[PDB]
Design a protein around this motif. Sequence first.
Motif, PDB file in Angstrom:
ATOM      1  N   UNK A  93       0.796  -1.218   0.000  1.00 50.62           N
ATOM      2  CA  UNK A  93       0.000   0.000   0.000  1.00 50.62           C
ATOM      3  C   UNK A  93       0.832   1.273   0.000  1.00 50.62           C
ATOM      4  N   UNK A  94       2.099   1.199   0.383  1.00 56.15           N
ATOM      5  CA  UNK A  94       2.994   2.348   0.388  1.00 56.15           C
ATOM      6  C   UNK A  94       3.928   2.220  -0.806  1.00 56.15           C
ATOM      7  N   UNK A  95       3.832   3.161  -1.740  1.00 59.06           N
ATOM      8  CA  UNK A  95       4.718   3.188  -2.893  1.00 59.06           C
ATOM      9  C   UNK A  95       4.791   4.616  -3.403  1.00 59.06           C
ATOM     10  N   UNK A  96       5.938   4.975  -3.977  1.00 58.26           N
ATOM     11  CA  UNK A  96       6.181   6.368  -4.329  1.00 58.26           C
ATOM     12  C   UNK A  96       5.627   6.715  -5.706  1.00 58.26           C
ATOM     13  N   UNK A  97       6.036   5.984  -6.736  1.00 60.78           N
ATOM     14  CA  UNK A  97       5.671   6.300  -8.108  1.00 60.78           C
ATOM     15  C   UNK A  97       4.383   5.586  -8.507  1.00 60.78           C
ATOM     16  N   UNK A  98       3.863   5.962  -9.675  1.00 61.79           N
ATOM     17  CA  UNK A  98       2.641   5.364 -10.199  1.00 61.79           C
ATOM     18  C   UNK A  98       3.007   4.321 -11.248  1.00 61.79           C
ATOM     19  N   UNK A  99       4.150   4.512 -11.906  1.00 58.61           N
ATOM     20  CA  UNK A  99       4.640   3.585 -12.921  1.00 58.61           C
ATOM     21  C   UNK A  99       5.586   2.604 -12.248  1.00 58.61           C
TER      22      UNK A  99
ATOM     23  N   UNK B 203      -1.399  -5.392  -9.927  1.00 58.89           N
ATOM     24  CA  UNK B 203      -1.367  -3.941 -10.095  1.00 58.89           C
ATOM     25  C   UNK B 203      -0.927  -3.566 -11.504  1.00 58.89           C
TER      26      UNK B 203
ATOM     27  N   UNK C 293      -3.732  -4.324 -13.957  1.00 60.10           N
ATOM     28  CA  UNK C 293      -4.823  -3.371 -13.805  1.00 60.10           C
ATOM     29  C   UNK C 293      -4.482  -2.017 -14.403  1.00 60.10           C
ATOM     30  N   UNK C 294      -3.219  -1.598 -14.327  1.00 57.55           N
ATOM     31  CA  UNK C 294      -2.809  -0.330 -14.918  1.00 57.55           C
ATOM     32  C   UNK C 294      -2.498  -0.441 -16.408  1.00 57.55           C
TER      33      UNK C 294
ATOM     34  N   UNK D 109      -5.419  -0.923 -20.365  1.00 55.78           N
ATOM     35  CA  UNK D 109      -5.671  -0.016 -21.479  1.00 55.78           C
ATOM     36  C   UNK D 109      -4.519   0.966 -21.693  1.00 55.78           C
ATOM     37  N   UNK D 110      -3.285   0.479 -21.539  1.00 56.41           N
ATOM     38  CA  UNK D 110      -2.076   1.143 -22.035  1.00 56.41           C
ATOM     39  C   UNK D 110      -1.905   2.547 -21.454  1.00 56.41           C
ATOM     40  N   UNK D 111      -1.808   2.605 -20.131  1.00 55.69           N
ATOM     41  CA  UNK D 111      -1.447   3.834 -19.442  1.00 55.69           C
ATOM     42  C   UNK D 111       0.058   3.872 -19.222  1.00 55.69           C
ATOM     43  N   UNK D 112       0.654   5.043 -19.448  1.00 60.36           N
ATOM     44  CA  UNK D 112       2.081   5.310 -19.291  1.00 60.36           C
ATOM     45  C   UNK D 112       2.939   4.541 -20.287  1.00 60.36           C
TER      46      UNK D 112
ATOM     47  N   UNK E  16       3.208   4.969 -23.418  1.00 63.04           N
ATOM     48  CA  UNK E  16       3.698   5.786 -24.522  1.00 63.04           C
ATOM     49  C   UNK E  16       5.160   6.174 -24.327  1.00 63.04           C
TER      50      UNK E  16
ATOM     51  N   UNK F  47      -1.093   9.818 -17.636  1.00 58.78           N
ATOM     52  CA  UNK F  47      -1.096   8.436 -18.127  1.00 58.78           C
ATOM     53  C   UNK F  47      -1.074   8.339 -19.643  1.00 58.78           C
ATOM     54  N   UNK F  48      -1.480   9.406 -20.321  1.00 56.66           N
ATOM     55  CA  UNK F  48      -1.593   9.416 -21.769  1.00 56.66           C
ATOM     56  C   UNK F  48      -1.058  10.737 -22.301  1.00 56.66           C
TER      57      UNK F  48
ATOM     58  N   UNK G 100      -8.262   2.506 -11.957  1.00 58.77           N
ATOM     59  CA  UNK G 100      -7.314   1.733 -12.748  1.00 58.77           C
ATOM     60  C   UNK G 100      -5.895   2.285 -12.707  1.00 58.77           C
TER      61      UNK G 100
ATOM     62  N   UNK H  83      -2.295   3.664  -6.571  1.00 58.90           N
ATOM     63  CA  UNK H  83      -1.443   4.667  -5.936  1.00 58.90           C
ATOM     64  C   UNK H  83      -1.300   5.892  -6.843  1.00 58.90           C
TER      65      UNK H  83
END
Lengths: 432, 430, 429, 429, 34, 30
Positions: free
Chosen positions: A169-175, A387, A390-391, A394-397, A399, D258-259, D343, D346
């Motif tokens: 539950x503790x994490x810094x970045x989103x990617x 995780x 789920x992220x 649909x191809x988030x980050x 690019x 994200x995009x 989706x 964090x």
Amino acid sequence: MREAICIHIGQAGCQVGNACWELFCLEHGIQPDGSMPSDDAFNTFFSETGAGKHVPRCLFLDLEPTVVDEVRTGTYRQLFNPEQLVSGKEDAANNYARGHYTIGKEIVDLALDRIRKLADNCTGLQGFMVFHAVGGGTGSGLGALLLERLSVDYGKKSKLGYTVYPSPQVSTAVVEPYNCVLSTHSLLEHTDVATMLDNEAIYDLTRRSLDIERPSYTNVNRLIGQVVSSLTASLRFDGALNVDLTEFQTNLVPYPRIHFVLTSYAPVVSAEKAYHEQLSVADITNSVFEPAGMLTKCDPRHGKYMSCCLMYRGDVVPKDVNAAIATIKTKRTIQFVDWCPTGFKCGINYQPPTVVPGGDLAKVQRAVCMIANSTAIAEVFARIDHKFDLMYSKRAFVHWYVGEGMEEGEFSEAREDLAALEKDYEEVGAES
Amino acid sequence: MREAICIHIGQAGCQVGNACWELFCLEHGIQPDGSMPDAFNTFFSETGAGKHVPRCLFLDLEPTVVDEVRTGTYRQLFNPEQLVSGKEDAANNYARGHYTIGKEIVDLALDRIRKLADNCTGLQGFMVFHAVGGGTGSGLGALLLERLSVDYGKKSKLGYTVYPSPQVSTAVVEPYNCVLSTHSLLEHTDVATMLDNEAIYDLTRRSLDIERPSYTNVNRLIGQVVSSLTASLRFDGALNVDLTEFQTNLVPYPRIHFVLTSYAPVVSAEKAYHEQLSVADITNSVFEPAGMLTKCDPRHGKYMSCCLMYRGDVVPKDVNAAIATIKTKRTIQFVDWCPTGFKCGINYQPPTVVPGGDLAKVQRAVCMIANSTAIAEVFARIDHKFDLMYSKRAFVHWYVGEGMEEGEFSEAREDLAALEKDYEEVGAES
Amino acid sequence: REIVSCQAGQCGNQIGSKFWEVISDEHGVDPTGTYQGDSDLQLERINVYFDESSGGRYVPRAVLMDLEPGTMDSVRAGPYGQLFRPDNFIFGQSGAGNNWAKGHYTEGAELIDSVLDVCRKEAESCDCLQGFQLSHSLGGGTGSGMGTLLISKLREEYPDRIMMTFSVIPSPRVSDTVVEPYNTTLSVHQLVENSDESMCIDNEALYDICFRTLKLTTPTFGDLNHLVAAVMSGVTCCLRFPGQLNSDLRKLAVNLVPFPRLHFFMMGFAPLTSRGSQQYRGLSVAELTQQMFDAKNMMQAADPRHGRYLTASALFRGRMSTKEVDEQMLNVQNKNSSYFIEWIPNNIKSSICDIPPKGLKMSVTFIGNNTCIQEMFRRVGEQFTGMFRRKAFLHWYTGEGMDEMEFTEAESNMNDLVSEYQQYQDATV
Amino acid sequence: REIVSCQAGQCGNQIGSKFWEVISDEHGVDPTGTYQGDSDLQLERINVYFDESSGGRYVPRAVLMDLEPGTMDSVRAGPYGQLFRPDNFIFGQSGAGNNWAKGHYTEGAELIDSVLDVCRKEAESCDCLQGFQLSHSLGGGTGSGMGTLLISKLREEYPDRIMMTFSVIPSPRVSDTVVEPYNTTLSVHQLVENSDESMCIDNEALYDICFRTLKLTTPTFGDLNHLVAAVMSGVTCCLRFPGQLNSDLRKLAVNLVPFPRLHFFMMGFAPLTSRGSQQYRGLSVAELTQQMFDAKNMMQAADPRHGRYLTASALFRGRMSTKEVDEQMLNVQNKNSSYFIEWIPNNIKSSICDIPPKGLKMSVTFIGNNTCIQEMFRRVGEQFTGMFRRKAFLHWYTGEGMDEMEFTEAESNMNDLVSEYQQYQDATV
Amino acid sequence: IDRALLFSVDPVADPAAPLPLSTYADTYGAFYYA
Amino acid sequence: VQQYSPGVLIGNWFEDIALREDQLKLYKNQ
Ligand SMILES: Nc1nc2c(ncn2[C@@H]2O[C@H](COP(=O)(O)OP(=O)(O)OP(=O)(O)O)[C@@H](O)[C@H]2O)c(=O)[nH]1
Ligand SMILES: Nc1nc2c(ncn2[C@@H]2O[C@H](COP(=O)(O)OP(=O)(O)OP(=O)(O)O)[C@@H](O)[C@H]2O)c(=O)[nH]1
Ligand SMILES: Nc1nc2c(ncn2[C@@H]2O[C@H](COP(=O)(O)OP(=O)(O)O)[C@@H](O)[C@H]2O)c(=O)[nH]1
Ligand SMILES: Nc1nc2c(ncn2[C@@H]2O[C@H](COP(=O)(O)OP(=O)(O)O)[C@@H](O)[C@H]2O)c(=O)[nH]1
Ligand SMILES: [Mg+2]
Ligand SMILES: [Mg+2]
């Protein structure tokens, strides 16, 4: 002789390594100038010089200078080489792509040359202890590249990767799940032993054990340094049952794919709690085996233990460690896997752990570090890949990873071998 | 820990709380600026600058009293927020303070209360201070108590209410306001404490020996009684009684929570060293009808439960002797089904005196909070006044045109009648 | 021969604090935890109460247990607070509020798990336990409810170990709360079934001792707690020290519990002489015997003359002739055979240790299963039913999650518990 | 790693000027240009925003642009105005007239050659350029049109470089131009299609803060520029100073959107406080975090409650422990799961910088893209279409070189952006 | 108005206060400095 | 809402007096 090379990747790795070298300098008496004021036990980490100066056997490797500059301008300016602290000009930016295909390539050759320079001085080189975090870019990308080249040009040389995986539950970045799932490629194919050092477990251990409400990365890295010192002390000092790097690796890792090993350390008490608890080795081992005294957020009871390495430091004796081992084996809460009933490694060292002045750790005459491989680790990976899926649905980050000179199907390959890791964990956990 | 959030509602509660916080700061050694050159935790929060601020919310519908506070010598102590002032007051109208003016300020008051509660990890109670004689402290008080009980739940609530006296009353519509607010106090007040003015006035005249006492003296006495009540949780003592600790002893039934208060020794410097300051003597003065803060003769009634809280160098011994003498003497009679009927809460911190005040320094003090069946007398007086004023329909169009139906008054009258009947029933013998 | 102690509530914490600082003084233990004794018989059996640490410090094997954190703060601020084990300070955030259920059912139940964890952690480190000691008060809220919850919980995992419960039970003349009846009536039967034998202390007998027996114009709670701790320490004298005719807690249970349900006792101690009367009084066991059996020298607010002793025991400490002490017990037996029960010969019991308390050449601890507990239980049950008939103060329990049926059952439990004593005291052969 | 600043229009020039006093004083540079800081940390990364002179003076790494010489006059007359290099001053003779056509096509293009010459020399002086930043207002054609024109050919020949941009989108409440929606629509599509990020400033919410959170008597445009300057300093504090967990503009950009289409942000600073709370309320991480997620501190006036936090990032400043910084942003994760998107696990990025802003011991800048960043685009599109129904004020644009269908293309880009925002607002797993 | 007054809890003590040392220097070698 | 000179206690007045006081503090420092 028993000579090892420390490597620090990323600014998190730089922090961990600086704490580790603080602890090493304290436990060897080497002043920050690099000279002992007033026996060959430092040769595993410090190199003698004709002038009587000792140089740490570590290589700092980062893409941004905003940490190595302070390392150069700090207390250990005289201790650390101004060389061997290599920093690039532009940060990896939480990108496996950037750290492994854009900026990693232009500095990996120089890092390998510096590894050459470190190793040629090593007459008895034994292993490479690499500290990093898979959360960031250079900890994933450049770490992967460096590990690949090291495996290519070293063959079966021992590698110990102390890595800070994303905590639940503790994490810094989103990617950060992207970076972890992508770096798992190299951390699986070119790492001999990997050790999880996530932040939640260390935070909770400090908050429930040190009785201090405001520790920080300082205390987290101090605990990491204590752990790594416990790992290295078996070969650094003489003991009743010494264990070397290969010594504990070849009987900790059951299969080449399965070399991700979760750790713990105990006792850990404050100054006012030091002189109140009966620090018997049995109770220390119980505090080791109980989940709340662990440096990883992976509760053992959901899985099955299949290898243990208990390394005691201090005035412990064989008929103190064996009694604790028997009690642990008898006690029902933890289940050992069927194929290896022994499943135990017992390292013993005569040197008690040292406490840094101003640190939260209290001076204790007994300690033990736990390096255990178990099928319970499947849960953290089933969390991180869930995780990532789920992220990534649909191809988030994606690019940035695509546009930094990196293909599209490597994500499929990474989820492929993470699923393979899930299923080999469950296969080895399944009863015969 | 032991947290008590103070709420003052309207003019009356604001002045009472001003005196109370005066006493708190003097006995905690807090300068007016807010610093001392962990007993304060229950009333003051300590910030990174080393200064302490009270955990109180002043809530008035008119700005004169809060502006007096904001211009007084205690500007640098009280928070600029948690000092809510409306723009137009209720003007002795429960309907106006509860339905139109109170509705546009209750949300902000609740936000401020939530901000105060989030700062405390050991919230134990709410200390409400109001007078149901007026309009603000009656209507906005009812609304605030309703919302607080709806949101927070079973958190302890102690409403110190200045009821309108049988004879000395400053306004005509006070019976209406009191009758209307009694229903709300009964439904969302865990413990309600009488703070009638005639008893305090007579007490100051005869014991404090003040020819012309005033609201400042009355509020000083109220601050003394609240300090004596909260000292058990504030400081160490032989018998530490928390808010719930003494709440579980004054409320045999949810409908029975109205209590009388008394404090002793209420004496000046001159008589402090002529009288004998024995615990037995102080307890006898407490149980004496004259030495009580509610204009309600206890002889015409009969006690249900008592709480004696001792402050200072008291010992359990002469407390026991005082209890035994109280049992032996038949002048004050107790209910049959309470053999014990006594709370004894001992605290080691003697009372402090506000400089320039009228109470003298004393080694020991006694505060009695008693639940008695004699409380029916003041309710009978107030609802008889209500009936007389309601007979031919006066001061009613003000409430009717403000948004209150005419049936609310009748419902409140029936609630008072039911409360009186319940008091008589519980006071009836076997 | 190992006993592990637990303190429950404010009363329990204070009484256990005073007991610990008197037992540590007896064993020569520094408030900081080190050893300053001069004798070896202390170190021979120091393990019964103090757990030795790797650092050479003897930490009390005690579990401090109270919902109120102010009591923990006070005990740590005490002179011997630093001696106590820090992680044994299990405490809640909100007080029990003088309520049964707020300590026994809702808030205590959440807290009690850690107490059992630490208690069994202490238990396992011992080679073998004689049993569990508890110090609490049925008068208090959390001292009664949550302590009785621990009482119930220890039985299911330690069935055949001694359970030494020291409760502090009230009387109206010094009743400091109006909830004494509820808090004791809901607590008596937990002690009944879930304690092998309970030894009780009354508040008013202690004040009677200080006023009449010891002539103290200013005795406080600290003054009272040492008198209670005298018995608290003398009960385990044979455990902790060698004895000419030794005994133990199982000895006392098997010798003072003829029938399983008759295990509530009244306490007595000796010597108790004021300093003024100390000069002219010769300290001998001969006079210590009438100090044993004297009415105003007793630790219970029930006059022995009204009741009749079923079985009683005496723990003598010092260098005395067992010859003379045994003939004295015989002498009191046959001098007042009417007070004792006829169909059990030798109702009084002799046990002889060697080590007396500090400064006392001779000391006595008296245990008695007198039938006069009938008066006390009957009267407190009357106090209970007086308000229980009116459904008063009961809303706290009903809202907190308690039903009427268990109330009626507990009232019946005192009824048929206290009904036994008169029909054993008036029985004829 | 270094950043080249550009200040377009009157609003951009003033905001960037304020940014330059705040940066210079934080780094220890007096308006004269010499260094007087007492810490090595100010000097060790003074090269990010300041170039060395032969005499050692620190000249800002900045370029100034306008079509009116009065703005250059005001900038030079400013307290720190003479700090700027003179050749960086680039001004026109005739103002744009709030006309995007004049700013972008005809008047801007005549000077953009010199602007790019200055920028290219400035970058070649830069050793390893980390990026450019632009400060401009979309309301006026001087800053919107000429700023977009500058961006268009800055990205052409610096394609792999960060293009930070602070766009001041004006609001109907503080609307003071009728061609405002025209300029906003005609600038937003270049801004979105030709920038890695583009983040928002709203004059309405700045006044809202100065009225409700900060409560000043006469907060003029200077105070608004001060808040915008402070948050501008905060967004690169981590790059200019060390910290526990460091980040840069690229490092936050790569994990804040994200995009590539969705790169519009909303602002944030803590702690904003008046004299009624600065001395009273304790400066703590709890206060910072609770003030980071309310509209009354948000300095863009689109209510986040109707939107969903697509991604957010927090740049802490000051010596502070490393748990709470993201423990209390795990609290928001758990308590506002509706506000946070599903989706992206964090949704909160966190960075810690050791050096706080001058005059504060604790601070944080909040930069995040939400789905409520769609509302001002919807309302600007409403106004733009409303005047476009009958080509209102359109001849001033079409007679300056603009074609009619370029407005159609801009409107189509608006429709695409708002549809994209709403479909990832209501997108489900 | 003045930025230091606008942003600082103490208008004169805050901006004149020295910048805090980096956590590296404050923790990792402060005892060696002594 | 008509603005009143300092000394009148309606509207923002407490913040106004605090602002004047801290201005005086800053000016005296200089
Ligand atoms: N154990 C430990 N982990 C840290 C520390 N600082 C950061 N981390 C971890 O590092 C992860 C992210 O990597 P970074 O610290 O940013 O280092 P990096 O790999 O160079 O990534 P960037 O700096 O953004 O380029 C975070 O998720 C943290 O868990 C630290 O001081 N100790
Ligand atoms: N005990 C006590 N009661 C007071 C004090 N001041 C006012 N009261 C009571 O409050 C009632 C109303 O007085 P007000 O000045 O109008 O104050 P209020 O309670 O706010 O009532 P409204 O303003 O009409 O809503 C009076 O009848 C008094 O009985 C005081 O200082 N002490
Ligand atoms: N011996 C002794 N008994 C006490 C002391 N304080 C309270 N008591 C007893 O405890 C009873 C009240 O218990 P209480 O304080 O409510 O206990 P709690 O609810 O567990 O905190 C009284 O009847 C007293 O007899 C003390 O300091 N010493
Ligand atoms: N925050 C802020 N906004 C401004 C300032 N000056 C102008 N504005 C607003 O910005 C909008 C655009 O005007 P502007 O860009 O200055 O026109 P230009 O001179 O042609 O570029 C106007 O509607 C103004 O309300 C300033 O100094 N600060
Ligand atoms: Mg025997
Ligand atoms: Mg970084």
